Symmetry: D2
Amino acid sequence: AKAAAAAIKAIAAIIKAGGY
Amino acid sequence: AKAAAAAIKAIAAIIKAGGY
Amino acid sequence: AKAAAAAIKAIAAIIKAGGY
Amino acid sequence: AKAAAAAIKAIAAIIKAGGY
């Protein structure tokens, strides 16, 4: 469940930034 | 899609490290 | 990398619905 | 965070199938 912050909190912010 | 193998890299590795 | 706007695009909504 | 091994399990298979 560590994974289930750290990966998500990266990706849901990197999505916003990345412009996917 | 430029965001892809710039985030996904740092995610598919983090999946493994995270232990999903 | 064209795997992009199919995968993440669903997943960013599935995130919001998932309550991650 | 129980949204994890539903949406992640899709994504880690969509990665493999997608060729990111």
